[PDB]
């Protein structure tokens, strides 16, 4: 039918919104070397899944990136280890920059699909 | 309380439920920026069954992602639900109108 | 929809850090002056979902 289209498009919109929020958060915290509990900030990424045939998309979980943490040398900060190294976040910039554009474009495509299907259903209603 | 009454009541109460859910959606989309607001919605199937058997208890939607201000309304999902409910209301209205016109056509000649 | 708030908060804190740096640079010749260190701090919002 066509009612499943609303569910599919809503799931896609939610997933794209989560991806955009994650990218924005990474860009904002790209240069924040600390945490409320003292642990350095680490880049995070969402994981997509297919929610059972075919179907929409869902965000299974947000996981920390396993890329090595960039570290700089300054003994002044108390956060420094025995060798004077502190751990800056290992978050790429251009990756997030392209993720934002890709997420926005996918969001627009999904909402256009939703609007088209709604118009088709309205036209079907007057058979 | 016989025949026509219930035969059209099953759809009239469905339309009433759709209208009430639409009003709740409008309220929670108009209140989408007040801090500490909770999204409100109802389970249409259970509510319709309870109404038919013969005040509606509104449930809280699980937040999609947190925010500091405490608001838990999700704008895109709310808009999608609003559009879906409007389309369902129109479908109910048109099927009710077609059924009523078919009933009225019998009382001719 | 609320990522705009995170972005504007980051921008405002960047402006605050810029103000701190400008303050440090302005009085670069006063005798016995100590610079004002600064570093961005992360605060994660959380609860019940993602």
């Amino acid at each position: 039918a066509l009612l499943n289209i609303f569910d599919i498009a809503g799931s896609a919109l939610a997933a794209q919104s989560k991806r955009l929020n994650v990218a924005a958060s990474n860009l904002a915290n790209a240069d924040s070397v600390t945490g409320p509990d003292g642990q350095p900030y680490r880049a995070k990424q969402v994981v997509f899944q297919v929610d059972a045939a075919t179907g929409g998309v869902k965000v299974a979980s947000v996981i920390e990136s396993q890329a090595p943490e960039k570290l700089v040398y300054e003994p002044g900060n108390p956060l420094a280890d025995a060798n004077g190294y502190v751990k800056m976040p290992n978050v790429d910039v251009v990756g997030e920059m392209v993720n934002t554009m890709s997420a926005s474009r996918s969001y627009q495509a999904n909402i256009e699909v939703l609007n088209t299907v709604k118009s088709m259903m309205l036209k079907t209603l007057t058979l | 309380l016989d025949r026509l009454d219930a035969a059209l009541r099953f759809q009239q109460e469905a339309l009433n439920l759709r209208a009430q859910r639409q009003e709740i959606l409008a309220a929670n989309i108009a209140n989408a920026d007040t801090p500490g607001y909770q999204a409100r919605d109802i389970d249409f199937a259970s509510e319709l069954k309870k109404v038919m058997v013969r005040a509606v208890d509104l449930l809280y939607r699980v937040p999609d992602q947190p925010s500091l201000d405490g608001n838990t309304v999700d704008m895109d999902r709310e808009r999608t639900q609003f559009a879906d409910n409007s389309l369902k209301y129109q479908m109910g209205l048109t099927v009710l109108g077609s059924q009523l016109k078919g009933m009225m056509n019998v009382l001719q000649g | 929809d609320h990522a705009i708030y995170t972005a504007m908060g980051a921008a405002s804190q960047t402006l605050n850090q810029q103000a701190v740096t400008a303050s440090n640079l302005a009085n670069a010749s006063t005798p016995g002056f100590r610079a004002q260190l600064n570093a961005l701090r992360a605060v994660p919002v959380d609860g019940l979902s993602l």
Partner: peptide, 21 residues
């Protein structure tokens, strides 16, 4: 509950503290 679903209990308030005690 899964995100976007219905629930019978309100979500706990969001705090976001600057630094834990």
């Amino acid at each position: 509950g899964v995100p976007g679903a219905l629930s019978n209990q309100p979500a706990p308030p969001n705090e976001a503290p600057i630094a834990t005690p």
